[PDB]
Amino acid sequence: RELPCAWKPVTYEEAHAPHYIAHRKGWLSLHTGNLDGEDHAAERTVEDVFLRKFMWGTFPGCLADQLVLKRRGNQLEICAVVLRQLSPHKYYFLVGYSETLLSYFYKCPVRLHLQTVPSKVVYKYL
Amino acid sequence: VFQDDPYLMPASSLESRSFLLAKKSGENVAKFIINSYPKYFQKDIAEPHIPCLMPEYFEPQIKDISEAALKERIELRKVKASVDMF
């Protein structure tokens, strides 16, 4: 009355912070560019950015975790973790489409390695 | 040809054939996009050059009335155009 009376689940990658990148986490993309003496780091980085945007737009709501972009010689492996929500026929169609389109866009033999999980692999609750 | 993931491994002959056909249809859609818009895939970055990863051109380039254009249309297997130009 009178005044004086008054008086979220996270995956393993999400759980760990950027300063654990070489201690507990790894690197999502692997290539030779950033090594001492090597060339074309910027080209690989731009390729990585486009690959991530393209995959996230071509597999909407399927990717359970981040992509892993591996590079061996001339090859380009997109190792992704997806859900078991979309039907397998659509997964095969999208894999074929993505392989062909990325192979012709980067002029290299791209290849996808989908791994399905039932649901987001929760590590803790931040 | 299939993927080792349990959810994607075909379980039956019909399912195996269906998955293969779906994959080929996806490849065909990508090929259609690539050939329909070569301007987005002409930029070559591969050394040595890879000819099999470049767009294919199915359109006549010679437009004049001449025997060379006829030979071009025969090379492209464009039957009706070849008859019309003959």
Partner: peptide, 29 residues
């Protein structure tokens, strides 16, 4: 479906399971 690692014998020919470099497959390893 169940993983195929349940069907692998303990004296199989492992090189045939991973002939070339491939990413880790939990249902195959």
């Amino acid at each position: 479906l169940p993983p195929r690692t349940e069907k692998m014998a303990v004296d199989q020919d492992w090189p045939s399971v991973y002939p070339v470099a491939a990413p880790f497959k939990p249902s195959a390893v």
